[PDB]
């Protein structure tokens, strides 16, 4: 209560009445007042797990989402009178609750405040961004400057539903409960990532390139416009007539690496390893490294994924079920 | 009765039309089977009390199935359109849904499903809401996509209901690689942008490296096993064999 | 090749009797039977609901000029859409290209894939194809623009919410409970002076750690730099030989000053001697960047001495050595078994390609193993095997796929739950034994 | 002179049809039907491998004129196949709201007349790099990956013209007329 000269920043009655509106969860009889073994309880419990002002904040967030669902790149927000009521009402009712909060007690110097972790700081950061996006209004911004980092944090909205709902608050406490445990597990997965990225850049550097047209085999001859067929249907197994050619068109010959993956630098080899770390899209790269660079090279990727997806993915899904025994109460 | 409820469900072998001359005598045969069934249900409700027939779940569910079957029979003989056979397919599905009264172990695993679906109000709406917000962030930068076979006209970055469906695809773990590798579009594969990120179509080079790991490494490795653990904690409590 | 199981006679004998073995196998067999008939009952439910839900998937939008005598893809478009004659169902493409049926144009039920919802067994195979967890883009991309919005999207969200995310995972709970029964039965079972100044100080360990980190950052820093390289005298090679002979002289100092009897008792110093041999042989020219390049990249495991927390987690991920190395040995064994039986059954019928080397059958059973696409192999065999001889080898592949993938990986996650829980004796000792804000305030 | 968007006989030049246009012409004004954008006489003046004006100087030119129309037909085969492939497409225009398939085809054929006919020619009335045309294709056409049957392709599309170590104006800037809308 002491050690603050700027304490209780500017009556002190009205806001504290309207914020601690303690609505009853279970209405009782006027005789004894016991627990409720009756049918109609889940509606009145869904009604009142928060306050009424917090109910209006949850309602305006959900209606802003379902109105802001029909955003599109050619259906704008900042130009028309129809959709600006989201930003207006959102900013104005945030200013109402925040003026109520700073008139009431303060910002952080009180222990009654919500700010001990993510909640208060994330509220005030979303409010700074939304205040300076209601005031800015540019009608032409390109993809070249970093103020759109602002505009990519403009839609991090539902990390605030995790603040007001206590159940959502406790499951996002669970969601960062083992975040240090899985930081160490991510260090182990990063060491596997680093050793195979070093393996990739230690053997395969610049070797995955070859002629796009299979027939030609030498780079000296890698010049001209060859004829490339175009994929029609993978699943059909139609047999081509003897005197007919598959659809295609004429394209230049190039000695180019595959787009999705390559192992020349540590970053793109790390991207290849990461993309095979989810266990999908992998027989393409397996048959590439068997077909083209050697029959002795793909077995290293075989033993790597046989160690990775069975000792790192399983260490993930095991230390988290161990942590779910810890926090939901089946540990000791 | 346990073999008759399986002999009723095998008449859905053919997609039901109004031209196939072998599904109308089998429709008449299933009309005779539902007549035998409603005869047995009437003798069962004259066998025991209607009050205990109302207090129990499976009895009044079967009574609802027989009422929908008899109104199906009288409306097929009154209207003769395809909507009669559609609601007949619906009551046949409700008849196959009346499998509850004979086995004990499948019920324990449907009760496992029931407490999976009722109790888990936590992380299903978390996943829906995060795929919704990531749909918004796909709109606020990556909203105009170049086309391939992956990014087709069926799930692209245009509308955020359609981008709910794109996220809803990318969370499933299959081929999110060349999904992410359809929109990293930089010169010399792009038009020179000066003042506007909407008029032209462009892709990020390093903000996508930030963004798609920021989406995938935090939920799309650890929260599906939390749903697995939901089915685990519904399993060890309700399932039992001989002890 | 089942003769190699004859070589496993010494370890098929156990410390506990056979009555507990037969009891756990009979109750887990009842468990897998009951949960698998739950699966097949929901499988028949989704089969009849897909036969009622969907129709004959031959209704493409290909131009009406199609030559029946010369049926070929050339006429058909590359990003082909499908139009169904029924109103407000299949999306219609711009005019000039009308839509006609393809099954009536002279094609049978075999050449147009094996997916579909016409009959019972095709819909069974289709619903079992959509549980692959990969490439279910196929059927939904067929069904979005053939059937209208809520029918298709409701059936596909209930399929993905039920079949792929709930009943894939009840077998994980099954095998978790059978290892819980294994847990309760296993509970029911029971100058030398440099040794005084360099081995005791902490400057040498951080010195060799910084050496290891600058080694692993100098070996991976070489990207393309054109196509001009000569491995006899070049950067990142003479430094590598210099650090190699530095490590060799350091290991000779460790073996001379400490001894030999204090070197074998550690579990990683034999690995360090093998490291020394491997880095000695790799820096020869003939074996530089060759097949024996195993022993250069794995120097990152030396970095384990940064934090003790990761070391005790490694000690808790390992435990004893008869539960996690025996499992990778027996997965290797059954992998060799099933690749040998597939190599023996599919080299006399001659209707399957990719059969040059034992690598190719290894890759075949590996792609069966690894939750990926395994219907293209049967799509390339069973259209040439025959008409009346298809479903038996189909359900043989089904049984092989299911006894290798849906159980074995859940055996891995259940045994990692056995590894990551504590022991059933320290739990009771901790049960009977139980009987920042200072910085903020500052 | 008059550009060849129109005109039959009063357009400073004649449309070649047979071996009739040039027995002995000191000055040639003849344009073509197929790739009219590229002028014939300056083509002869710059690079003309089969036969050229100087070669005759020290009927040869009409002989290679017939070969030129045949080469044009070959170019027509390339252009015709590309248009046909686009015909059997349903994402021809919808692929992007900015770029257009018409511009994609015009720059496609422009590059077809740039690295099949490698000629530097004056009178274009504009100075723009020639090899850049392929890069132009890379910016106006969507990704159409080819069939992986012969060789597995890791997401490498078929329309792409450049890549690693390709002739994308590497230390050379040939000048020729460009034809585009925007």
mmCIF file with all atom_site columns, C-alpha atoms in Angstrom, chain C residues 168-258:
data_model
loop_
_atom_site.group_PDB
_atom_site.id
_atom_site.type_symbol
_atom_site.label_atom_id
_atom_site.label_alt_id
_atom_site.label_comp_id
_atom_site.label_asym_id
_atom_site.label_entity_id
_atom_site.label_seq_id
_atom_site.pdbx_PDB_ins_code
_atom_site.Cartn_x
_atom_site.Cartn_y
_atom_site.Cartn_z
_atom_site.occupancy
_atom_site.B_iso_or_equiv
_atom_site.pdbx_formal_charge
_atom_site.auth_seq_id
_atom_site.auth_comp_id
_atom_site.auth_asym_id
_atom_site.auth_atom_id
_atom_site.pdbx_PDB_model_num
ATOM 1  C CA . UNK C 1 168 ? -6.505 -44.623 -34.111 1.00 0.00 ? 168 UNK C CA 1
ATOM 2  C CA . UNK C 1 169 ? -5.789 -43.741 -30.482 1.00 0.00 ? 169 UNK C CA 1
ATOM 3  C CA . UNK C 1 170 ? -7.870 -46.256 -28.504 1.00 0.00 ? 170 UNK C CA 1
ATOM 4  C CA . UNK C 1 171 ? -5.276 -48.915 -29.427 1.00 0.00 ? 171 UNK C CA 1
ATOM 5  C CA . UNK C 1 172 ? -2.619 -46.688 -27.846 1.00 0.00 ? 172 UNK C CA 1
ATOM 6  C CA . UNK C 1 173 ? -4.735 -46.858 -24.668 1.00 0.00 ? 173 UNK C CA 1
ATOM 7  C CA . UNK C 1 174 ? -5.037 -50.662 -25.140 1.00 0.00 ? 174 UNK C CA 1
ATOM 8  C CA . UNK C 1 175 ? -1.290 -51.257 -25.324 1.00 0.00 ? 175 UNK C CA 1
ATOM 9  C CA . UNK C 1 176 ? -0.715 -48.725 -22.506 1.00 0.00 ? 176 UNK C CA 1
ATOM 10 C CA . UNK C 1 177 ? -3.001 -50.860 -20.341 1.00 0.00 ? 177 UNK C CA 1
ATOM 11 C CA . UNK C 1 178 ? -1.290 -54.117 -21.329 1.00 0.00 ? 178 UNK C CA 1
ATOM 12 C CA . UNK C 1 179 ? 2.060  -52.625 -20.261 1.00 0.00 ? 179 UNK C CA 1
ATOM 13 C CA . UNK C 1 180 ? 0.363  -51.455 -17.051 1.00 0.00 ? 180 UNK C CA 1
ATOM 14 C CA . UNK C 1 181 ? -0.471 -55.136 -16.519 1.00 0.00 ? 181 UNK C CA 1
ATOM 15 C CA . UNK C 1 182 ? 3.191  -55.910 -17.312 1.00 0.00 ? 182 UNK C CA 1
ATOM 16 C CA . UNK C 1 183 ? 4.151  -53.295 -14.683 1.00 0.00 ? 183 UNK C CA 1
ATOM 17 C CA . UNK C 1 184 ? 1.960  -54.875 -12.015 1.00 0.00 ? 184 UNK C CA 1
ATOM 18 C CA . UNK C 1 185 ? 3.200  -58.396 -12.880 1.00 0.00 ? 185 UNK C CA 1
ATOM 19 C CA . UNK C 1 186 ? 6.822  -57.185 -12.721 1.00 0.00 ? 186 UNK C CA 1
ATOM 20 C CA . UNK C 1 187 ? 5.984  -55.658 -9.344  1.00 0.00 ? 187 UNK C CA 1
ATOM 21 C CA . UNK C 1 188 ? 4.626  -59.079 -8.350  1.00 0.00 ? 188 UNK C CA 1
ATOM 22 C CA . UNK C 1 189 ? 7.856  -60.731 -9.642  1.00 0.00 ? 189 UNK C CA 1
ATOM 23 C CA . UNK C 1 190 ? 10.259 -59.357 -6.979  1.00 0.00 ? 190 UNK C CA 1
ATOM 24 C CA . UNK C 1 191 ? 55.612 -37.166 -15.467 1.00 0.00 ? 191 UNK C CA 1
ATOM 25 C CA . UNK C 1 192 ? 52.244 -37.894 -13.814 1.00 0.00 ? 192 UNK C CA 1
ATOM 26 C CA . UNK C 1 193 ? 51.968 -34.321 -12.454 1.00 0.00 ? 193 UNK C CA 1
ATOM 27 C CA . UNK C 1 194 ? 49.661 -33.298 -15.327 1.00 0.00 ? 194 UNK C CA 1
ATOM 28 C CA . UNK C 1 195 ? 47.049 -35.532 -13.674 1.00 0.00 ? 195 UNK C CA 1
ATOM 29 C CA . UNK C 1 196 ? 47.155 -33.180 -10.660 1.00 0.00 ? 196 UNK C CA 1
ATOM 30 C CA . UNK C 1 197 ? 46.800 -29.891 -12.584 1.00 0.00 ? 197 UNK C CA 1
ATOM 31 C CA . UNK C 1 198 ? 44.883 -30.671 -15.806 1.00 0.00 ? 198 UNK C CA 1
ATOM 32 C CA . UNK C 1 199 ? 42.515 -33.488 -14.795 1.00 0.00 ? 199 UNK C CA 1
ATOM 33 C CA . UNK C 1 200 ? 41.457 -31.557 -11.667 1.00 0.00 ? 200 UNK C CA 1
ATOM 34 C CA . UNK C 1 201 ? 41.087 -28.080 -13.185 1.00 0.00 ? 201 UNK C CA 1
ATOM 35 C CA . UNK C 1 202 ? 38.157 -26.880 -15.294 1.00 0.00 ? 202 UNK C CA 1
ATOM 36 C CA . UNK C 1 203 ? 40.059 -24.936 -17.971 1.00 0.00 ? 203 UNK C CA 1
ATOM 37 C CA . UNK C 1 204 ? 40.854 -28.056 -20.034 1.00 0.00 ? 204 UNK C CA 1
ATOM 38 C CA . UNK C 1 205 ? 37.238 -29.242 -20.311 1.00 0.00 ? 205 UNK C CA 1
ATOM 39 C CA . UNK C 1 206 ? 36.003 -25.872 -21.556 1.00 0.00 ? 206 UNK C CA 1
ATOM 40 C CA . UNK C 1 207 ? 39.089 -25.725 -23.810 1.00 0.00 ? 207 UNK C CA 1
ATOM 41 C CA . UNK C 1 208 ? 38.219 -29.028 -25.487 1.00 0.00 ? 208 UNK C CA 1
ATOM 42 C CA . UNK C 1 209 ? 34.537 -28.038 -25.566 1.00 0.00 ? 209 UNK C CA 1
ATOM 43 C CA . UNK C 1 210 ? 35.425 -24.843 -27.449 1.00 0.00 ? 210 UNK C CA 1
ATOM 44 C CA . UNK C 1 211 ? 37.582 -27.029 -29.742 1.00 0.00 ? 211 UNK C CA 1
ATOM 45 C CA . UNK C 1 212 ? 34.566 -29.279 -30.400 1.00 0.00 ? 212 UNK C CA 1
ATOM 46 C CA . UNK C 1 213 ? 32.281 -26.306 -31.120 1.00 0.00 ? 213 UNK C CA 1
ATOM 47 C CA . UNK C 1 214 ? 34.764 -24.667 -33.497 1.00 0.00 ? 214 UNK C CA 1
ATOM 48 C CA . UNK C 1 215 ? 35.189 -28.085 -35.174 1.00 0.00 ? 215 UNK C CA 1
ATOM 49 C CA . UNK C 1 216 ? 31.438 -28.478 -35.709 1.00 0.00 ? 216 UNK C CA 1
ATOM 50 C CA . UNK C 1 217 ? 31.140 -24.896 -36.978 1.00 0.00 ? 217 UNK C CA 1
ATOM 51 C CA . UNK C 1 218 ? 34.106 -25.181 -39.385 1.00 0.00 ? 218 UNK C CA 1
ATOM 52 C CA . UNK C 1 219 ? 32.947 -28.497 -40.903 1.00 0.00 ? 219 UNK C CA 1
ATOM 53 C CA . UNK C 1 220 ? 29.459 -27.275 -41.881 1.00 0.00 ? 220 UNK C CA 1
ATOM 54 C CA . UNK C 1 221 ? 30.390 -23.757 -43.065 1.00 0.00 ? 221 UNK C CA 1
ATOM 55 C CA . UNK C 1 222 ? 31.254 -24.900 -46.619 1.00 0.00 ? 222 UNK C CA 1
ATOM 56 C CA . UNK C 1 223 ? 28.475 -24.346 -49.149 1.00 0.00 ? 223 UNK C CA 1
ATOM 57 C CA . UNK C 1 224 ? 28.815 -24.476 -52.942 1.00 0.00 ? 224 UNK C CA 1
ATOM 58 C CA . UNK C 1 225 ? 31.604 -21.955 -53.854 1.00 0.00 ? 225 UNK C CA 1
ATOM 59 C CA . UNK C 1 226 ? 31.358 -23.031 -57.484 1.00 0.00 ? 226 UNK C CA 1
ATOM 60 C CA . UNK C 1 227 ? 32.574 -26.332 -58.906 1.00 0.00 ? 227 UNK C CA 1
ATOM 61 C CA . UNK C 1 228 ? 36.315 -25.903 -58.214 1.00 0.00 ? 228 UNK C CA 1
ATOM 62 C CA . UNK C 1 229 ? 37.597 -28.125 -55.401 1.00 0.00 ? 229 UNK C CA 1
ATOM 63 C CA . UNK C 1 230 ? 40.719 -30.216 -54.796 1.00 0.00 ? 230 UNK C CA 1
ATOM 64 C CA . UNK C 1 231 ? 40.696 -32.331 -51.636 1.00 0.00 ? 231 UNK C CA 1
ATOM 65 C CA . UNK C 1 232 ? 44.493 -32.739 -51.377 1.00 0.00 ? 232 UNK C CA 1
ATOM 66 C CA . UNK C 1 233 ? 45.238 -29.139 -50.314 1.00 0.00 ? 233 UNK C CA 1
ATOM 67 C CA . UNK C 1 234 ? 42.260 -26.873 -49.598 1.00 0.00 ? 234 UNK C CA 1
ATOM 68 C CA . UNK C 1 235 ? 40.628 -24.934 -46.771 1.00 0.00 ? 235 UNK C CA 1
ATOM 69 C CA . UNK C 1 236 ? 38.532 -26.972 -44.259 1.00 0.00 ? 236 UNK C CA 1
ATOM 70 C CA . UNK C 1 237 ? 40.853 -29.945 -44.935 1.00 0.00 ? 237 UNK C CA 1
ATOM 71 C CA . UNK C 1 238 ? 44.327 -29.042 -43.599 1.00 0.00 ? 238 UNK C CA 1
ATOM 72 C CA . UNK C 1 239 ? 42.624 -27.515 -40.552 1.00 0.00 ? 239 UNK C CA 1
ATOM 73 C CA . UNK C 1 240 ? 40.671 -30.775 -40.202 1.00 0.00 ? 240 UNK C CA 1
ATOM 74 C CA . UNK C 1 241 ? 43.873 -32.866 -40.325 1.00 0.00 ? 241 UNK C CA 1
ATOM 75 C CA . UNK C 1 242 ? 45.466 -30.387 -37.871 1.00 0.00 ? 242 UNK C CA 1
ATOM 76 C CA . UNK C 1 243 ? 42.614 -30.736 -35.359 1.00 0.00 ? 243 UNK C CA 1
ATOM 77 C CA . UNK C 1 244 ? 42.657 -34.506 -35.960 1.00 0.00 ? 244 UNK C CA 1
ATOM 78 C CA . UNK C 1 245 ? 46.345 -34.901 -35.096 1.00 0.00 ? 245 UNK C CA 1
ATOM 79 C CA . UNK C 1 246 ? 45.790 -32.523 -32.152 1.00 0.00 ? 246 UNK C CA 1
ATOM 80 C CA . UNK C 1 247 ? 43.044 -34.849 -30.877 1.00 0.00 ? 247 UNK C CA 1
ATOM 81 C CA . UNK C 1 248 ? 45.283 -37.873 -31.534 1.00 0.00 ? 248 UNK C CA 1
ATOM 82 C CA . UNK C 1 249 ? 48.153 -36.381 -29.502 1.00 0.00 ? 249 UNK C CA 1
ATOM 83 C CA . UNK C 1 250 ? 45.666 -35.442 -26.760 1.00 0.00 ? 250 UNK C CA 1
ATOM 84 C CA . UNK C 1 251 ? 44.244 -38.979 -26.636 1.00 0.00 ? 251 UNK C CA 1
ATOM 85 C CA . UNK C 1 252 ? 47.768 -40.429 -26.567 1.00 0.00 ? 252 UNK C CA 1
ATOM 86 C CA . UNK C 1 253 ? 48.481 -38.098 -23.629 1.00 0.00 ? 253 UNK C CA 1
ATOM 87 C CA . UNK C 1 254 ? 45.312 -39.337 -21.888 1.00 0.00 ? 254 UNK C CA 1
ATOM 88 C CA . UNK C 1 255 ? 46.299 -42.972 -22.467 1.00 0.00 ? 255 UNK C CA 1
ATOM 89 C CA . UNK C 1 256 ? 49.944 -42.456 -21.408 1.00 0.00 ? 256 UNK C CA 1
ATOM 90 C CA . UNK C 1 257 ? 49.435 -40.338 -18.277 1.00 0.00 ? 257 UNK C CA 1
ATOM 91 C CA . UNK C 1 258 ? 46.298 -42.000 -16.866 1.00 0.00 ? 258 UNK C CA 1
#
